[PDB]
RNA sequence: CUGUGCG
């Protein structure tokens, strides 16, 4: 005991802060007994950690560790049999509790299992306790530190250690011991010798179902004989029988199967497209009616603007009175309007935005001014005072900065109202709910109305997501089949000419598809457009793109201008196609495209499979579909009618089809409907493993098994490998032989392949699971309120305002649903703390009963019913606590809605009703720590994983999210597989290299022409099985570099199987709407398996999974060694030359021949049924000819490479994604890089710089001379960044380049003294660092200048609003959540949305209080704060550029260009040479002349420029912003510190301009390749290049 | 939290 009495000594800093400290510290002095002295030890430890961690939260210590039943019998309370649990901490308060249960663990993985563990097992008590009781609120406490703020933190260590001192010191179980030892460490792979390996009377049979058939010793020339003896019996049983799977094209045949496919002949639908789609008839009617056809309008939008931000303010606490509030201002400014001025209304105002008896207000509503009197006539007489009352309220507590003089407290004279309402006459819209052609023969228009067409699409696009923009906490104040009438709805304006304005009108708010209706207004004059019903988030895509459709669509028609006519039969046909394909968004009509990119793939190439026509066929629904498939076939008849062999210009009919088919790209990929994308990934995840018929119900989730589940699991394994080597049954179910399997492994083990196994660089060196996709999870939603109830009775300490619902705004940043729900909760466990029958039945939530049950009117008809003691007078906003369900009750009832008013009434009536190793499992010992695991389990869980999809073009993607042991386990089989593939060398995922070596390979080989075989591979994923991988490591070696030690693989092996062991959790929503509940087997499967079997099922167990994104490289390399198993078999018994490469789902077959191509057809089958054999299913996608290639979506043709325009033109107008403008506009520069090259255009890239300069300045930010990419820039993109295409925009803002010359010759100078000339730099930081003017100056007497530069070239000014910061915004992000190189810096270091919401988000967040000062303001006072002083100077570029004098009002936000003009030459100077400071001079093709270049960069700032450079710069120059906000998690430092190749070439001088200026981005993005390294050009482009070369 | 413009 030499530590013991030490222990006692230093167990004396502690204080007995409560009476227990000094019971449980007299008993422990009291008692020197080798056994129990640590139990208490440990148990005192816990209590004090538990005690620290709930007396922060106002604990009551549960000092006798009862249960829950008898201190709820402690009060008065009845017993419901509540299940037994003991508490931590508990806190009751009337009819409330509070339970909270803490922990500790220092791992963070038993830390966040624990933490599931207590939630999980407390979550279920709430169902039963509320049922016939009082309610509780869940809170736990994780800690993985065992820190306190009760000692001084350096003795807790110093306890620990003595303590595992003590305990190893002496003992006297062994995995308690190894349990308790590791727990109690810090910081702790591979290697998993100590685990225990046990046996559970499981492990046997598993082996002999899996390692009977296994030798891995077989010789070489058994294996050639039985080689040929198998191709000798394949000759004449299959192939001579004619039961192959490919053949020949035979072209003509092939296009009347395309024509029965695609053109319907059984269809009724007619050949005109305008009057089979609503869209296009009312685009159509639109486009015919408008082509052959004053300061009052600005007040009457800006008091509209005024009024519509000052109701945004919500100061009324109420919303129908505000809304008659604002609509009364409104009709009073109309009449004080109309009083005067007479020629306004009929002239001036019917022109404008205007319809019968209709008028706009705010929140964009239509409203009726006959209605409108009918109801403002109401509370006169009632309580005429209440015009008085808000009157006053405009003058206290309210902004004061309004212009309402006289148009607020004046009252309506309705003499007036129904004089204007007499003046129009009667034409109320009717809105059609729910057959002669005159549809113009669009094949006979002009040249001219189709972009007319197009520009009125953008803007009926704009017009939709303008109101899909509108607010949603919107009601109507009067509520309403076939033909319903409009009074109240929602509108939106539109502008097409000077005098006519069309409009659209809504009925119903959110994000879900409406019914909307289109009308027009000529002059003044109401006509019927038309109506339709559609989801507006599936036309982001047209807002603006009017014209570089169009401009795609004269280059896309020009590529077929080597015979003259077949444009004019082929064009405005391709017009209406992509027209077509932009009105009508879903998933059938890209599949379609794809469908006949397949189609064309294997028509085009010589050897195609017999199964394609029965891929291509899609069934059509709304007559929507029929039409643009009708087109495409005749698109693809007319270009393939005649003689089309490979005999003539086939390579620009083949570009011309693909790109058509990629067309399919303009669709948006966000799964119209979500629960049925949950269905389809569901059906599609269980409909093989049952129609194999292994899956199990919900298994034990710990690692146990009944007889049945290991029985069938045995079943599943023996079936698997039940396949023989000469049956051709089994050619579609799953499986393999394992005699084939010991066929390869036995040739690959001797060295007889392209590799062997001589590897070398040793490879030994917080979620629900139940759902995917919601925003929110039960967990959070409950962690949130338990924090925020917490926080409220803390602060008791009643009344208690609306405020607390700013906290619910805090933590956070169907949303608003969420917000609305957790409002509602928390309100009414305050109430609680404060102090029809079918509901019981059924379940007992009211928050979840649906309105779909019971009829409106009994709804509204029994909330007006007698109540005394449920309603209280007025609204009283101080809510004192004990009457908050009446306030809720009577601010629910004075609203329109009453859903709230009826479930606050129904829960008003309370309708609602000594061993070591047991008894220290409960305090802090970690149980779950995996110590012995069996062949099923790791003592940690059973690798629970949750299904999830993701949008793809063509179908949805499966994905599965693993937990964090699951996490860490896959992470290192990846790492190992990895190791392993890097080892190899043919494989082609992730070593460019070999993808470039692999696409040189298949350009000269289709150069040369020999044989292409692209395999593409069905069911790649689900098919796969784990015991795959068991077996062939199993009768693997993985023999060491020098050492041929045989490596063993036992922890691979294991953790393998546990994959094999793993179990996948089915989503909760799919699961309630099968229960809830057209046949589906899904739907059958499900139904057999709720009760006949079990219960119901969550939890799906099976063999053969593969789950896609866990095992991508295992599988790669599996299928690398097949397929060079499959091409050295087939180079031995064809002699013919294979060569192949792979990545994983596709790989790629390059075949030399020998010694026209129809002879070749049995090798083909025979590799076909080998493939089969083995679990290698192939799609018959494939194409087994020699014309052209594919490989991951990248083609290959006789003499060049596909554009692939399309494509990239969608991606790059999709996907912009809005945070802030520059970041946009980066994005956008990067994305218009990668499209220039692959040889697009140089002018479709100015027509999409031009969409998005005109779509951010509609946003109301402004442009900015920087602004998005530059218009009509050249091909000079190549050997150009960012920095010289913004010079080159200023440039070009300036027409006359004269002080620009200048300048540039001081930059000149500048650069000549800072590289070599004289002595320079370190000086520069000292000027840069300060501010903006003085050092232009600076630098112009460092160059040489006079005071007149110095007050000349500062006379050029912009305006740059993120002077004082960044735009402080809030966008529509994922909930629950210093200059930007820094951040880049920092993340470099370290290691569902859509696109219309994000936009949507940007613009509504820009315009509130986003600028800052001093203070947070608007952009409008700025920008309206310019003086138009108009002098000569500040005109040549309107609201780019402005005067100093042009800016004496406001000048914080004013900055000099000729700054950024510096910025831009200097990080050119570094970057790309110094060639850019000459001047550029200008120079003085059948388009078809391609051709590829390099970039001609000269670097002078050591081009290589390693890692660890600019740290040691910053360290030196900064060092205060080095210290904080840099490297703080970082342990290799010090080879930075001793002088890391410190002070570079140029690196020292030009990194501050990046410090000072947040628009440049250079050390970012310096730091990365090119990326291209070469570039498609056609010489047109070519020959108007601008020359810029400099002299010395 | 707090959207009003493409002429
Ligand atoms: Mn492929
Ligand atoms: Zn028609």
């Known amino acids: 005991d030499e530590y013991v009495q030490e222990l006692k000594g230093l167990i004396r800093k502690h204080i007995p802060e409560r009476c227990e400290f000094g019971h449980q510290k007299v008993t422990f002095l009291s008692q020197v007994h080798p056994s129990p002295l640590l139990t208490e030890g440990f148990k005192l430890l816990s209590s004090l950690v538990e005690l620290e961690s709930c007396e922060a939260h106002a604990c009551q210590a549960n000092t006798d560790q009862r249960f829950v039943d008898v201190i709820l019998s402690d009060n008065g309370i009845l017993c419901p049999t509540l299940p037994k649990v003991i508490p931590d901490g508990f806190k009751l308060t009337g009819k409330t509790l509070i339970l909270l249960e803490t922990f500790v663990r220092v791992n963070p993985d038993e830390f966040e299992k624990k933490w599931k563990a207590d939630m999980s097992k407390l979550l279920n008590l709430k169902h039963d306790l509320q049922k016939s009781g009082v309610t509780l609120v869940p809170i736990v406490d994780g800690r993985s530190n065992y820190n306190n703020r009760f000692v001084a933190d350096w003795v807790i260590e110093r306890i620990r250690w003595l303590l595992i001192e003590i305990l190893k010191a002496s003992k006297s179980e062994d995995q308690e011991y190894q349990r308790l030892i590791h727990s109690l460490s810090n910081v702790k792979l591979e290697n998993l010798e100590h685990l225990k390996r046990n046996s559970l009377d499981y492990d046997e049979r598993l082996n002999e179902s899996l390692f009977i058939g296994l030798k891995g010793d077989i010789r070489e020339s058994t294996v050639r004989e039985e080689l040929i003896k198998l191709k000798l019996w394949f000759k004449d049983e299959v192939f001579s029988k004619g039961l192959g799977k490919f053949k020949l094209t035979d072209r003509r045949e092939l296009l009347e199967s395309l024509s029965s496919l695609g053109a319907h002949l059984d269809s009724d639908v007619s050949s005109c497209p305008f009057c089979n789609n609503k869209l296009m008839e009312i685009v159509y009617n639109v486009t015919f009616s408008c082509v052959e056809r004053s300061n009052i309008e600005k007040h009457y939008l800006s008091v509209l603007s005024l009024c519509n931000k000052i109701k945004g303010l919500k100061v009324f606490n109420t919303r129908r009175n505000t809304l008659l509030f604002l609509d009364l201002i409104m009709v009073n400014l109309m009449v004080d309007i ?115 067409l197009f520009k009125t699409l953008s803007s009926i696009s704009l017009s939709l997501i303008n109101s899909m923009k509108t607010s949603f906490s919107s009601r109507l104040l009067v509520n309403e089949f076939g033909n319903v009438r409009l009074r109240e709805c929602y509108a939106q304006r539109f502008y097409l000419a000077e005098s006519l304005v069309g409009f659209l009108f809504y009925q119903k708010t959110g994000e879900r598809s409406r019914c909307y209706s289109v009308y027009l207004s000529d002059n003044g004059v109401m006509s019927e457009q038309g109506s339709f019903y559609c989801d507006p988030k599936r036309f982001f895509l047209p807002v603006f793109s009017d014209e570089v459709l169009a401009g795609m669509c004269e280059e896309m028609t020009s590529w077929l201008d080597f015979d003259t006519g077949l444009m004019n039969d082929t064009g405005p046909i391709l017009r209406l196609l992509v027209l077509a394909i932009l009105c009508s968004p879903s998933k059938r009509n890209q599949t379609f ?67 058509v088919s990629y067309l399919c790209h303009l669709i948006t990929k966000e799964t119209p409907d979500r629960l049925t994308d949950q269905i389809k990934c569901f059906e599609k995840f269980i409909e093989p493993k049952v129609k194999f018929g292994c899956a199990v119900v919900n298994p034990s989730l710990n690692g146990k098994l009944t007889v049945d589940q290991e029985d069938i699991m045995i079943n599943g394994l023996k079936k698997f ?77 009643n009344l ?98 009453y859903f709230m008013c009826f479930k ?42 949750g299904l999830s999809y993701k949008e793809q073009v063509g179908s949805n993607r499966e994905l599965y999210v693993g937990d964090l042991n699951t996490k860490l386990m896959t992470r290192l089989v990846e790492d190992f597989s990895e190791a392993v593939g890097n080892s190899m060398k043919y494989t082609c995922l992730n070593s460019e290299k070999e993808f470039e070596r692999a696409i040189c390979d298949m350009k000269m080989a289709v150069n040369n022409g020999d044989l292409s075989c692209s395999y593409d591979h069905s069911k790649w994923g689900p098919t796969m099985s784990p015991a795959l991988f068991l077996a062939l490591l199993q009768m693997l070696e993985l023999r060491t570099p020098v050492d041929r030690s045989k490596i063993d693989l036992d922890s691979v092996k294991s953790i393998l199987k546990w994959h094999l062991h793993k179990v996948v959790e089915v989503p909760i929503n799919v699961a309630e709407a099968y229960c809830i509940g057209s046949t589906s087997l899904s739907e059958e499967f499900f139904h057999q398996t709720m009760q006949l079997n079990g219960q119901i099922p969550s939890h799906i167990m099976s063999v053969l999974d593969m789950g896609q994104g866990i095992l991508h490289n295992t599988s790669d390399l599996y299928g690398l060694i097949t397929e060079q198993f499959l091409c050295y ?283 800052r000062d001093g203070g947070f303001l608007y952009i409008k006072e700025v920008y309206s704060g310019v003086s138009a002083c108009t002098c000569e100077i500040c005109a040549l570029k309107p609201k780019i550029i402005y005067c100093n004098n042009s800016l004496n009002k406001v000048s914080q936000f004013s900055k000099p260009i000729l700054w950024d003009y510096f910025s831009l030459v200097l990080t050119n100077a570094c970057e790309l040479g110094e060639w850019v400071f000459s001047t550029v001079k200008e120079p003085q093709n059948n388009q078809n002349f391609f051709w590829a270049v390099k970039p001609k960069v000269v670097r002078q700032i050591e081009d290589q420029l390693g890692m660890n450079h600019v740290l040691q710069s910053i360290r030196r120059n900064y060092p205060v912003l080095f210290d904080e906000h840099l490297t703080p998690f970082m342990n290799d430092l010090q080879v930075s510190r001793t002088m890391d190749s410190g002070r570079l070439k140029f690196l020292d001088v030009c990194i501050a301009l990046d410090m000072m200026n947040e628009n440049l981005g250079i050390i970012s993005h310096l730091l990365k390749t090119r990326d291209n390294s070469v570039y498609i050009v056609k010489q047109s482009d070519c020959a108007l290049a601008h020359i810029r070369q400099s002299s010395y």
């Open 593 to 659: 495209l794809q469908g006949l990119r397949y189609f064309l793939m294997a028509f085009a190439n010589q050897i195609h499979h017999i199964d394609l026509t029965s891929k291509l066929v899609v069934e059509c629904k709304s007559s929507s579909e029929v039409v643009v498939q009708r087109l495409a076939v005749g698109l693809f008849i007319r270009l393939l009618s005649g003689e089309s062999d490979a005999s003539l210009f086939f390579s620009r009919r083949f570009k011309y089809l693909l790109n």
């Open 1129 to 1411: 078999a087939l180079d031995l018994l064809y002699d013919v030359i294979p060569v192949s490469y792979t990545s994983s789902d596709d790989q790629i077959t390059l075949i030399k021949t020998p010694s026209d191509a129809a002879e070749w057809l049995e090798m083909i089958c025979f590799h076909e049924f080998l493939s089969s054999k083995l679990n290698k299913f192939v799609s018959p996608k494939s194409v087994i000819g020699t014309f052209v290639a594919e490989f991951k979506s990248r083609f290959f043709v006789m003499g060049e490479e596909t554009p692939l325009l399309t494509k990239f033109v969608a991606a790059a107008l999709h996907n912009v994604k809005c945070k802030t403008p520059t970041q946009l506009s980066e994005t956008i520069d990067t994305i218009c890089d990668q499209c220039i090259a692959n040889g697009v255009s140089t002018k479709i890239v100015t027509r999409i710089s031009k969409r998005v300069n005109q779509l951010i300045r509609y946003s109301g930010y402004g442009e900015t001379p920087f602004g998005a990419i530059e218009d009509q820039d050249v091909k000079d993109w190549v050997d150009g960044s960012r920095g010289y295409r913004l010079q080159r925009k200023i440039e070009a803002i300036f027409h006359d380049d004269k002080e620009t010359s200048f300048i540039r010759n001081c930059a000149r100078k500048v650069f000549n003294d800072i590289k070599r000339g004289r002595i320079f730099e370190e000086n520069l930081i000292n000027l840069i660092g300060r501010g903006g003017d003085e050092a232009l100056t600076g630098f112009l007497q460092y160059a040489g200048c006079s005071e007149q530069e110095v007050n000349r070239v500062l006379n050029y000014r912009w305006v740059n609003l993120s002077s004082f910061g960044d735009l402080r915004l809030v966008l529509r992000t994922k909930l629950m959540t210093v200059p930007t190189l820094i951040k880049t810096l920092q993340s470099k270091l370290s290691r569902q949305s859509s696109v219309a919401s994000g936009f949507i988000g940007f613009c509504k967040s820009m315009g509130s209080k986003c600028v």
């Open 904 to 945: 606050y009434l129904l829960i008003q009536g309370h309708f609602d009703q000594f061993t070591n190793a047991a008894l220290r499992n409960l305090c802090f010992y970690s149980e779950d720590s995996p110590t012995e695991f069996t062949s099923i389990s790791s003592n940690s869980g059973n690798l629970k994983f």
């Open 338 to 452: 109309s009083d005067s001025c007479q020629d306004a209304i009929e002239s001036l105002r019917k022109s404008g935005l205007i319809v019968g008896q209709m008028v706009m207000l705010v929140n964009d509503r239509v409203l009726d001014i006959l209605e409108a009197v009918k109801l403002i006539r109401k509370k006169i007489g009632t309580n005429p005072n209440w015009v008085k009352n808000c009157s006053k309220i405009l003058e206290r507590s309210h902004p004061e900065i309004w212009h309402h003089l006289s148009t607020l407290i004046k009252q309506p004279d309705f003499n007036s109202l129904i004089s204007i309402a007499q003046h129009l006459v009667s034409d109320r819209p009717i809105m059609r709910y729910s057959k002669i052609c005159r549809h113009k023969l669009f094949q006979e228009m002009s040249s001219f109305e189709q972009m007319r």
């Open 800 to 897: 208690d305002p609306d405020s607390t619902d700013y906290l619910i705004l805090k933590n956070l940043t169907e949303q608003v649903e969420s917000f609305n729900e957790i409002k509602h909760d928390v309100q009414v466990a305050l109430a609680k703390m404060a102090d029809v029958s079918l509901h019981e039945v059924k379940d007992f939530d009211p928050d979840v009963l649906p309105p779909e049950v019971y009829k409106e009117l009994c709804d509204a008809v029994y909330k007006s019913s007698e109540k005394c003691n449920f309603f209280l007078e007025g609204v009283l906003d101080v809510c004192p606590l004990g009457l908050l369900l009446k306030n809720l009750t009577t601010s629910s009832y004075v609203d329109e809605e």
């Open 721 to 797: 490998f039940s396949k023989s080597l000469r049956d051709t049954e089994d050619v579609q179910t799953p499986g393999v032989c394992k005699e084939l399997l010991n066929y390869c492994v036995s040739l690959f083990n001797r060295g007889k392949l392209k590799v062997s196994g001589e590897l070398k660089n040793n490879p030994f060196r917080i979620p629900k699971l139940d759902e995917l996709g919601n925003i929110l999870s039960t967990y959070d939603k409950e962690k949130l309120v338990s924090a925020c109830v917490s926080s409220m009775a803390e602060r008791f300490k």
